[PDB]
Design a protein around this ligand. Structure first.
Ligand SMILES: CCCCCCCCCCC[C@@H](O)CC=O
Length: 7
């Protein structure tokens, strides 16, 4: 969930 967490 890149944008949010990174990973
Ligand atoms: C608070 C939420 C934690 C979610 C942790 C998910 C770990 C497994 C997935 C990793 C890849 C993820 O970052 C790709 C997003 O699109």
């Amino acid at each position: 969930e890149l944008x949010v967490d990174x990973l």
